[PDB]
C-alpha cells in the first residue's frame, strides 16, 4: 500500500534527521537566558503562538512525514508525573544519533553496541542517591512555598525582570487548590495598568458584564442571586391554544399578566435586600427598569463556568424557578462593585468567607508578550505540585550533566574489547549540554567547556554554569534545581527508543507492491 | 477492457513481474521470527499500519494496473476454507514463473509445458497421506487445546510478549462454538483500558449503544424485546393527506392519536416486567420519556448484525408489530448491564442459557502496539476453527517442504523429454523456502540448506528448521504446526493459478466472490 | 515552525534599522520650528490625519515587519504619567544604536559594554535634583494658570500665530476638571471663522441638531424636557396628552434621545416649542448634570419630576453655520469649548491641539518640577558624562564615552532644522553649558546660544527622568535576547 | 592567537593602567602575562618616527585631490 522506500542505512537516516531538526529549536530554550520562539502557520491557528515551554508546542502539532511523533508523545507522559521545570530531555536523545555515522566505520554488528544502553542506566543511579541536597516541601509550608523551582522555570522565560515575583504569587494559588479537589475553579486575566506588583490576588471571582447604562454604580451589604431559568416568559410547552380576541380591549389583559411577573420579582427581592443578580443566558427586559429604581445591579448573559465556581464560593444556592431567593439562596456580603483598574471598568466579587475558590487578576507591562501571562501562569500552577510530593531534587545549570559525563568516560576506556567503543560514544553525549547553556548567554562556548569540566570533576555537585558570570559558579546560591523524576525517566525513555532496534532482529525492508 | 493486448514474451512478463514483486515481501513474514513492515500512503490512510498478516494488507489495497489482485483476492477464500497458518501459498505460486526464462531457450509451445501441472496433481496427491502427521484432536480436550498453532501464528507477530497469553484464550472460544450449526455468532471488540490479561471472555454479547441521559442505572431478571418495525408513526400509504382543520381544536385530536401509540407500548410492557428494549432502526421520541419512568433500558438504532446473533443467544423471538411482547417474544434473564471498563462506557449482555455463541473483549496499555491486538485477533479466530473440522495437520517450520522436494527430484528423470525439464523446475522451487527461513534467523543460509536436506531424507517428519538454533531441530517440541488442508489446497491452487497466466491474453474484471 | 528568526549579528540590525527610520520623522517635529507631517494609508484610514504629536501617530499604525511597535508603546505609559511637552525621548534612543556599528570593531562580548547602562542610571539622576528649575503651581493659580508650558507645546505647532491665546484658555478647562469626576465631560468643536479672539469657552453644552424647517426661531424662560422613551407608539389621544401638560409648563424645548414620531412634530410647531430629534445620548447625560437633573420615564415626565434650567436656549448664527446653544447653567460643573478660525486647512489642526492640551497641564501641576528645553539639558548632561567615562577603568571607559557622544547630536539636530551652520553651533554651545549657566540653551532664531527661560520653553521633569531609565529599556536586553517582532494580526 | 578576544581586551587594559610596562599580550598563555620574561622588545626609533610620520602622511590625505595611477592587479 504505497511506499516512500527506505531500507538498511537509509531507514536509520530518517531517525537521524528527525532528532537533529528538533534539537536546534529547543536548544535556545534551555536555561535562565533561553529564547522565546514564535511559530506561524495557517488555517486553524490564531496569530503567531510563541511558547517558551517546548512540550506545549510539540503536543499541538505533527508538521511532516519524518518520524518523531511517538518520541514527542513520550514527553507528555513524563509531564503527567513531573514533566517540566525547564526542557532538556529532548536535546539529549538527538545527540545519541550523531555517533551512528561512526558506526559505519565498524561496518557490521550495531546490535553488539546496543549493550551501552544497559550501561546508561548505571549512570542514572551513580549520579543520583549520593550527596544529599534537599528533603521536605511537606504541605502548605510557610517559607518553602516558592522562591526556588518556580523562579527557575520563569528564568528561561523573558518576563523574569518583574515576573519572578509573579511566580512567587502562584504557590499561594496552588495552596488553596490543595485538598479534596482536582484542578478546578482557577481563573486568570491580565490588565494594561502599571504597578511594581504587576498583579493582584483576588479574594473572590472576577467578571466583566453590565446591566445597562442605568442602575446605581455600586452596592453595599450585597446579596447574590443566580437563576438557572431565564427571565423570559410566554409560549410554554403547550400554548393553551392560539388566541383571537374581538377588539383591542381584551388583548390588554394579556399585557396585565406580564405585569404580574414584574411585580413578584420586586416584592420579595426587596425583602432579601438583593444587591446583585447574575443570570446565565438571555435576560427579560421588563425587570431591567425595576432593578434601577430598587438599587440592584444585575448581569446579562453571565458565563455559566463563572457561575458554578461562584456557587462554591458563596455557599451556593439551589437554582430553580423564581421561588429561588430568600433562604433557598445564600449570599456572601463583603464588597461587590464595579471599579476602574488602570484604564478600564470591571466588576469584582470579593470577601468570600469560605476561601476554597479564588480568582487571580494579572497586570502587565503592555507588550504582546503580555499575552504570555496566560501561557506562563498555566505552567506555574502545576510546577509546584511536583516539588511537593517528589521530595527529591538535583542541581541545575548542567551540574548533573558534566558529572555524569566524567563517570561514563572512565568506563569506556578502562574496558579492553569492543565493549569500549560502544560505551564511549554514549559518554560524549553529556558534553553537548554544557555547550548549549553557555552559547545562549553570549559567551563563546570553547573557553567555557575547558574551565567547566575541571570544577565538576573534582567533586562539587553544587557548582554549575553561571551565564551571568560567563564562567562557572555555585548553582545552589542561584536556587536552580531539577525534579528527581525528570532525571530518572529521561535516561530510561531515551534508551528504550534505541532499544527498539535491539528488540527487532534483522529488519528485511520495504512494502508489498 | 479497452485494449492493451499483449502476447507471449511481454504478456508473460506482466504476470511474471507481479509474482516476483509479491514474493519477496511476503517472504520476510514466514516463521516464528517474522519481520514487521510499515506502509505509507496518502488520502484516507493517515499513518503507517504495521501488518504481518500476508493476507490483510493485500486485501486492503488494489494499488496498480497489472494482474494479481484476483490471485490475491482468492487467498481469502482459502482463509474461509482453512485459514492463514503462516503465509506461504502465494510464494510457491510465484516461484514456478522463475524458470519461464529458461523456457525461452526451449522456444516451442509454452502451452505444451502446462502439462506438468497435470502431473502436479499427482504431486499434490503424493504429498497427501505420506507426510505422517499429528493425531488426536479428541474434542474439547484438556491440555492439547492450545499453546501450539495459535502461538505459531503469533510467533512471527510483535505482540507475542503479551498476546501469547490471549492467543491461548481463542481455543476456549472454539470449543463452545463446535456442534451442529456452522460458523456463526462470533464477535470481538477492542478497548483502551490496561490490564495484565489483555482480554476478557464474555459469557454473552457486547454492543456499545445507550438510550439517553435519563433511565435506571441497572436492570435485574431482564426480558428482551426486539422489533422489526420502527416506533415512528404518521405517513403510511394513502396518506389521509396533508391537513388543515376547521378550528385548530381538532388538530389536538391528531396529537391525542399519538398518545394511543404510547399507551399500547406501556400497558403491555409493564405486565412482562420489561427490563430492556432493542430496536434495529430509528426510535420515536414519545416512548423515550415513558421508558425512563418504567425502569426500562432501550436501544436506539441498534445494528441488525448484533441483533441476529443475540436472537440465537437469547432463544429468539418472533418479530412483528406491537403485538410482539409476552409469549411471541422469548427473553433470556441472567444479567444486562452497562458497565464501565476502565474508561469508555459500553453495554454487556450476559448469562445466556444456550451457550452456543459468545463475545471476546480486549484491553491494553494505550499505543500503536496495543492496536495490533485488533490485527492479531482476526487471525486467531480463523486458525482454531479450522483445526477442529480438518482433524488433520502437518509439521511446520519448513519440515513439510524439504521432504516433498526430495521426492520431486526423482520425478524429472522419470518423465519423458519436454515434461522432464519443466517437472524438474517445479521441484527446485521448494528449495527456496528452506533458504528464506534460515536467512532471517541471523545464521548463514548456505550451511542451513545442506543440513536440512539430510534430516528429511532420513525419514524424520518431526525434524525441521530451527531459526533460534541456526540449525535443524525437532519441530513438534516447538509447537509449530500447519493445518492439513492449508497444504492440500495450496498445492492445487498454485497449480491452477500459475497455468491461467500463460493461457489468457485479455485480463481485467467482473464476477463471483 | 518559524518565520524570520534572527540572533546576535543579524538581530541587532533589525533593531538598528527601526531606530533610524523613526528618528528622521520625529526630529523635524521638535520645538518652535517643528514641521508637520502627513501619512496616508489606503485601507481603513479614512482621511489624512495630520499629527504633530509624535506619540499619537506611532501608536495608531504598525506599518511593517521590522520591530519597533513595542518600543513605541512604552511612550504612552509616559503619556499617562506626563507624556508630551515636546517630543524628544524617541530621538535619544535611536542615536544609541548608531555606535553599535563601531562595537563590531571590538569583535567581542556586548554584555561587558552593558555595564554602561547601570552607569547611565547614575548619570540619569545627576541631571535630577541638580540645577533648579521652577516653583509653585500647587493648584488652581490665578496668574500662573498659563502663559508658560502650554505655549511651549504649541510652539512646535504652527497654529501659535494666534493659537497661543487658545492654549491659555485650556488651563481654565483643567481646573474645573479637577474634583471627583477624574477624566470625563470635555467637549470641543471648531467653527469656520470671523474673529480675532478665535475662541469663546461656553459655560454650558453645545449641540448641533434641528426639529425641522418649521418651529419658532427663539424660546424665552426655556424649560427642558428629556424622555427615555421615544415619541413613537388612538394616536390623536397621545397628541392630546402631550399638549395638555405642555401648555401649563410653558415648554420651550424638548430633547429626545432616539427616533421621534411624526404626529407630535406638527403640534410642537404651532405650540411654539423647539424639539431635537435623535439627540446623542452622551450630550444628554452631561446636560442633565448641567440643568439640575430630571426624572425621565413615561409622558408623566413633565412638571415637578423634571427640572429645567431657565437662562436661555436659542439657535444662533456663528460666523455662518447654524447651531443650537445651550447656556446659562448656574450649577457650573460641566463646560464646552468652541473654537473659531479664518476658513483654513490649518484650522482643522485646532481639533488636534485641544485634546493634547488637557494632558500637559494636568501632569505639569503634579510633578512640581521642570527642565530647560531647547537642548539646554542635553549639552549640560553631555559635559557631565564625558568626565564619567574617564573615571571608569579600561574596558568600561570606551563604552561609557560612546554614550556620552550620543548626547552631542541632540544640540546638532535642533540647529540643523534652523538653517544655521551645524559645525559652528556645536563648538559654541558646549562652552556656555560647561561654564555653569543652566538657563542657557540653543536659540534657533539667534543661530547661536541664548536664555531659554525668557522664551518660556520648558520640558516636564517627568519626561527627562523616565527617558533616562528608558535610555536603556532593553538596549542591553536586546542583544542578550533573540525574538521580538510581533503585532500585525493573523 | 586562537583565544577569546573579549576576555583579553578587558584584562589587558587594567594591567597597563596599573604601571607595568613589562606586562603585555601573551598569546601562548591565552591571557595577559609578563612580556619581559618572554624577551620580546621593539626598537625605540620605530615608535618615535611612526607617530610623527603617521600623522603627517595621513594629513596629506584630505588636502590632496585626485591621487591617480595604474590598473588593479
Specify whether C50 is located in the same domain as C129.
yes
CA distance A11 to A507: 10
Spatial contact of C260 and C250, defined as CB atoms under 8 Å apart? no
The set of long-range contacts for A502-508, using a CB threshold of 8 Å and a minimum separation of 24, is: A502/A111, A502/A114, A502/A117, A504/B35, A504/B36, A504/B158, A505/A111, A505/B33, A505/B442, A506/B33, A506/B35, A506/B440, A506/B441, A506/B442, A507/A7, A507/A8, A507/A11, A507/B35, A508/B27, A508/B28, A508/B35, A508/B37, A508/B440
The boundaries of the domain holding residue B274 are: 203-355
CB C230 within 8 A of CB C275: no
Nearest to A29 by CA among B62, C483, B189: C483
Beta bridge partners of C306: C294
d(CA A99, CA A112) in angstroms, rounded, equals 15
The SS3 of residue C70 is helix
Report helix angle A89-96 to A69-81, nearest 10.
140
Q: 3-state DSSP call for residue A305?
A: helix
Residue whose entry in the numeric block shows the C-alpha cell 469656520? C192
B25 with B56: CB under 8 angstroms?
no
| DSSP strand pairing (C336-340 vs C253-256) | unpaired
Strands C37-39 and A224-227: unpaired
Single residue among A391, A415, A444 that ends a domain in this structure: A391
Q: Residue C36 region, left (φ>0) first, then alpha (ψ -120 to 50), else beta?
A: beta
Going by C-alpha positions, the residue among C18, C58, C41 that lies closest to residue C475 is C18
Domain boundary, last residue among B355, B383, B409: B355
Q: Inform me whether the C-beta atom of residue A235 falls under 8 Å from chain B C-beta atoms.
A: no
DSSP for residue C202: B
Nearest CA to C484 out of C31, C70, C64 is that of C70
Are residues B490 and B403 both part of a single domain?
Answer: yes
Residue B206 grid cell: 457486547
Mutation target vs A (from D1, D2, D7; most A CBs, 10 A cutoff): D7
For the record, the C-alpha cell of A375 comes out as: 501561557
CA distance C107 to chain D (A): 7
Cross-chain residue pair C395–D13, CB shorter than 8 Å:
yes
Q: Which residues are registered as beta bridge partners of C189?
A: C338
What is the DSSP code string of D45-62?
HHHHHHHHHHHHHHHHHH
Experimental technique: cryo-EM
DSSP class per residue in C102-143: HHHHH-S-HHHHTHHHHHHHHHHHTSSSSS-------SS-SG
| C394 vs D5, D7, D10: nearest CB | D10
Return the HEC string of A336-365. Answer: EEEEEECCEEEEEEECCCCCCCEEEEEECC
- Report the alpha-carbon distance of residue B415 to residue B411 in Å, rounded: 6
A448 to chain D, closest Cα gap in Å? 10
C436's CB contacts (< 8 A; 6+ apart) are: none
How many structural domains are present in chain A?
Answer: 3
Q: Closest Cα of chain B to A88: distance in Å?
A: 24
Best C106, C115, C393, C394 residue to mutate vs chain D (most D CBs within 10 Å): C394
Contacts of residue A447 in chain D, CB cutoff 8 Å?
A: 3-4, 7
Give phi and psi for B420, each to the nearest 5. Answer: -60, -40
CATH number of the CATH domain containing B163: 3.30.260.10
C31 annotated as a binding-site residue? yes
CB contact under 8 A, A38 and C483: yes
- The 10 Å CB-count burial string (b at 16+, else e) for B64-81 is eeebbbebbeebeebbeb
User: For residue A243, what are the contacts with CB-CB under 8 A and spacing of at least 6?
Assistant: A254
What's the CA gap between B230 and B301, in Å, rounded? 10
CA B16 to chain centre: 29
**Rounded distance between C-alpha atoms, residue B329 and residue B228, angstroms:** 12
Residues A428 and A302 in one domain: no
Query: Strand, coil or helix: what is B249?
Result: coil
A195: left (phi over 0), alpha (psi -120 to 50) or beta: beta
**DSSP character string of A80-131:** HHT--SS--HHHHHHHHTTTHHHHHHH-S-HHHHTHHHHHHHHHHHHHSSSS
- Calpha distance C401→C113 (Å, rounded): 11
Task: Work out the angle between the directed axes of helices C461-469 and C349-367 (0-180°, nearest 10).
Answer: 80
Q: What are phi and psi of B444, to 5 degrees?
A: -70, 120
Do B183 and B310 have their domain in common? no
CB contact under 8 A, D14 and C394: yes
CA angle, B19 then B20 then B23, to 5°: 85
What distance in Å separates the CA atoms of residue B475 and residue B464, rounded to the nearest whole number? 6
- Which region, left, alpha or beta, applies to residue C324 given φ > 0 means left and ψ of -120 to 50 means alpha? beta
Residues facing residue A189 across a β-bridge: A361
Contact D3 A447 (CB under 8 A): yes
Three-state secondary structure of B268-318: HHHHHCCCEEEECCCCCHHHHHHHHHHCCEEECCCCHHHHHHHHHHHCCEC
Choose the mutation target among D1, D5, D6, D10 for the interface with A, i.e. most A CBs under 10 Å.
D6
Are B194 and B369 spatial neighbours (Cβ–Cβ below 8 Å)?
no
- Give the distance from residue D56's alpha carbon to the nearest chain A alpha carbon, in angstroms: 41
Answer yes or no: are the C-beta atoms of B215 and B361 closer than 8 Å. no
Distance CA C184, CA C262 (A): 35
Chains that touch C (3 or more CB pairs under 8 A): A, D
C247 and C310, same domain (yes or no) = yes
Task: Tell me which residue has cell 518556580.
Answer: A150
Give bridge partners of residue B341 from the DSSP assignment: B344
Provide the grid cell at C335.
463646560
**CATH number of the structural domain spanning residue C214:** 3.50.7.10
CB atoms under 10 Å from CB of B298, counted, come to: 24
| Cα-based distances in Å from C58 to A116, A365, B127, C70 | 61, 18, 93, 10
CB of A33 closer than 8 Å to CB of A467: yes
Sign (positive/negative) of CA torsion C417, C420, C426, C432?
Answer: negative
CB contact, 8 Å: A444 with chain D?
A: yes
In a shared domain, residues C312 and C387: no
Same domain? For A288 and A145 the reply is no
* Chain A residues lying within 8 Å of C473, measured CB to CB: none
* Chains C+D touching (3+ CB pairs under 8 Å): yes
DSSP at A143:
T
3-state percent breakdown (helix, strand, coil) of chain D, nearest 5: 50, 10, 40
- Between A and D, how many residue pairs show a Cβ–Cβ distance under 8 A? 8
Strands (E), B8-74: 38-39, 49-50
Task: Indicate if B196 and B246 belong to the same structural domain.
Answer: no
Residue A291 near residue A298 (C-beta atoms within 8 A): yes
Count CB pairs under 8 A between chains A and C. Answer: 58
| Nearest chain A CA: its distance from B41 CA (Å) | 5
| Angstrom distance (rounded) from CA B165 to CA B198 | 8
Bridging pattern class, strands A297-299 and A276-279: parallel
Farthest-apart Cα atoms in chain C, separation: 97
| Same structural domain, C21 and C111 | yes
- The C-alpha angle A103, A104, A106, rounded to 5 degrees, equals 70
3-state secondary structure of A440: helix
**Of A355, A378, A404, which closes a domain?**
A355
Q: Both ends of chain D: CA-CA distance in Å?
A: 31
How many Cα atoms occupy the beta-carbon half-sphere of B436 within 13 Å?
26
Same domain as A457, residue A494:
yes
Q: Is the dihedral of CA B320, B322, B328, B332 positive or negative?
A: positive
What are the cell numbers at A261?
A: 411577573
Same domain assignment for residues B162 and B227 = no
Q: Answer positive or negative: Cα dihedral of B87, B89, B93, B95.
A: positive
Q: Which CA distances in Å does A251 have to A248, B72, B501, C232, C447? A: 5, 80, 90, 20, 87
Let me know whether C449 and C339 are in one domain: no
Amino acid at each position: 500500500a504505497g511506499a516512500d522506500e527506505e531500507r538498511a542505512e537509509t531507514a536509520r537516516l530518517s531517525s537521524f534527521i528527525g532528532a537533529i531538526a528538533i534539537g536546534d529549536l529547543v536548544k535556545s530554550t534551555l536555561g535562565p537566558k533561553g529564547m522565546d520562539k514564535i511559530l506561524l502557520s495557517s488555517g486553524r491557528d490564531a496569530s503567531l503562538m510563541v511558547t517558551n515551554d517546548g512540550a506545549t508546542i510539540l503536543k499541538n502539532i505533527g508538521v511532516d512525514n519524518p518520524a518523531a511523533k511517538v518520541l514527542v508523545d513520550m514527553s507528555r507522559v513524563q509531564d503527567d508525573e513531573v514533566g517540566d521545570g525547564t526542557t532538556s530531555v529532548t536535546v539529549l536523545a538527538a545527540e545519541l544519533l550523531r555517533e551512528a555515522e561512526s558506526l559505519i566505520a565498524k561496518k557490521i554488528h550495531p546490535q553488539t553496541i546496543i549493550a551501552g544502553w544497559r550501561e546508561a542506566t548505571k549512570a542514572a543511579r551513580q549520579a543520583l542517591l549520593n550527596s544529599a541536597v534537599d528533603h521536605g516541601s511537606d504541605e502548605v509550608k510557610f517559607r518553602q512555598d516558592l522562591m526556588n523551582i518556580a523562579g527557575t522555570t520563569l528564568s528561561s522565560k523573558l518576563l523574569t525582570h518583574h515576573k519572578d515575583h509573579f511566580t512567587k504569587l502562584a504557590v499561594e494559588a496552588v495552596l488553596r487548590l490543595k485538598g479534596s479537589g482536582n484542578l478546578e475553579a482557577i481563573h486568570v486575566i491580565k490588565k494594561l495598568g502599571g504597578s511594581l506588583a504587576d498583579s493582584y490576588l483576588d479574594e473572590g471571582f472576577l467578571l466583566d458584564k453590565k446591566i445597562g447604562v442605568n442602575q446605581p454604580k455600586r452596592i453595599e451589604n450585597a446579596k447574590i442571586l443566580i437563576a438557572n431559568t431565564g427571565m423570559d416568559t410566554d409560549k410554554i410547552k403547550i400554548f393553551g391554544s392560539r388566541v383571537r380576541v374581538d377588539s383591542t380591549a381584551k388583548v390588554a389583559e394579556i399585557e396585565h399578566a406580564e405585569k404580574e411577573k414584574m411585580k413578584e420579582k420586586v416584592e420579595r427581592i426587596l425583602k432579601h435586600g438583593i444587591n446583585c443578580f447574575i443570570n446565565r443566558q438571555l435576560i427579560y427586559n421588563y425587570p431591567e427598569q425595576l432593578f434601577g429604581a430598587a438599587g440592584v445591579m444585575a448581569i446579562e448573559h453571565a458565563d455559566f463556568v463563572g457561575v458554578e465556581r461562584l456557587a462554591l464560593v458563596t455557599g451556593g444556592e439551589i437554582a430553580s424557578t423564581f421561588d429561588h431567593p430568600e433562604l433557598v439562596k445564600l449570599g456572601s456580603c463583603k464588597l461587590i462593585e464595579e471599579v476602574m483598574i488602570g484604564e478600564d471598568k470591571l466588576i469584582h466579587f470579593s470577601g468570600v468567607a469560605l476561601g476554597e475558590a479564588c480568582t487571580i487578576v494579572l497586570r502587565g507591562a503592555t507588550q504582546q508578550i503580555l499575552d504570555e501571562a496566560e501561557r506562563s501562569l498555566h505552567d506555574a500552577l502545576c510546577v509546584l505540585a511536583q516539588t511537593v510530593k517528589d521530595s527529591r531534587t538535583v542541581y541545575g545549570g548542567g551540574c548533573s550533566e558534566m558529572l555524569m559525563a566524567h563517570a561514563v568516560t572512565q568506563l569506556a576506556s578502562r574496558t579492553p574489547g569492543k565493549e569500549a567503543v560502544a560505551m564511549e560514544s554514549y559518554a560524549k553525549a553529556l558534553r553537548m549540554l554544557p555547550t548549549i547553556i553557555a552559547d545562549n548567554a553570549g559567551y563563546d562556548s570553547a573557553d567555557l567547556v575547558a574551565q567547566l569540566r575541571a570544577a565538576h570533576s573534582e567533586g562539587k555537585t553544587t557548582a554549575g554554569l553561571d551565564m551571568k558570570e560567563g564562567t562557572i559558579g555555585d548553582m545552589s546560591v542561584l536556587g536552580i534545581t531539577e525534579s528527581f523524576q525528570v532525571k530518572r525517566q529521561v535516561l530510561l525513555s531515551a534508551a528504550e527508543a534505541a532499544e527498539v532496534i535491539l528488540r527487532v532482529d534483522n529488519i528485511i525492508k520495504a512494502a508489498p507492491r
